[PDB]
Amino acid sequence: VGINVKCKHSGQCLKPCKDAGMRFGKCINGKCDCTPK
């Protein structure tokens, strides 16, 4: 789930999610959400 970054796509979020300790990314309300383990 969520990190603390602003995304445009579910990629824009995937990179920081993964990079922050997650698996994938999903953008919700302009902010990021992750799809972790």
Curated annotation (Swiss-Prot):
Disulphide connectivity of cysteines: 7-27, 13-32, 17-34
Note: Negative results: has no effect on rat Kv1.4/KCNA4, Kv1.5/KCNA5, Kv4.1/KCND1 or human Kv11.1/KCNH2 and Kv3.1/KCNC1. Has no effect on bovine KCa1.1. Does not inhibit the growth of Gram-positive and Gram-negative bacteria. The primary structure of this mature peptide is identical to that of toxin alpha-KTx 3.19 from Mesobuthus eupeus (AC C0HJQ6).
Protein name as annotated: Potassium channel toxin alpha-KTx 3.6
Coiled-coil regions, chain positions: none
GO molecular function, one term: potassium channel inhibitor activity
Keyword Thylakoid found: no
Keyword field: Amidation, Disulfide bond, Ion channel impairing toxin, Neurotoxin, Potassium channel impairing toxin, Secreted, Signal, Toxin, Voltage-gated potassium channel impairing toxin
Family: Belongs to the short scorpion toxin superfamily. Potassium channel inhibitor family. Alpha-KTx 03 subfamily.
Positions carrying Lysine amide: 37
Function: Blocks voltage-gated potassium channels. At 2 uM, blocks rat Kv1.1/KCNA1 and Kv1.3/KCNA3, has a strong effect on rat Kv1.2/KCNA2 and Kv1.6/KCNA6 as well as a moderate effect on Shaker IR.
Lineage of the organism: Eukaryota, Metazoa, Ecdysozoa, Arthropoda, Chelicerata
UniProt main location, coarse: secreted
GO cellular component, one term: extracellular region
Compartment list: Secreted
Domain notes for this protein: Has the structural arrangement of an alpha-helix connected to a beta-sheet by disulfide bonds (CSalpha/beta).
Expression sites by tissue: Expressed by the venom gland.
Top-rank lineage group of the source organism: Eukaryota
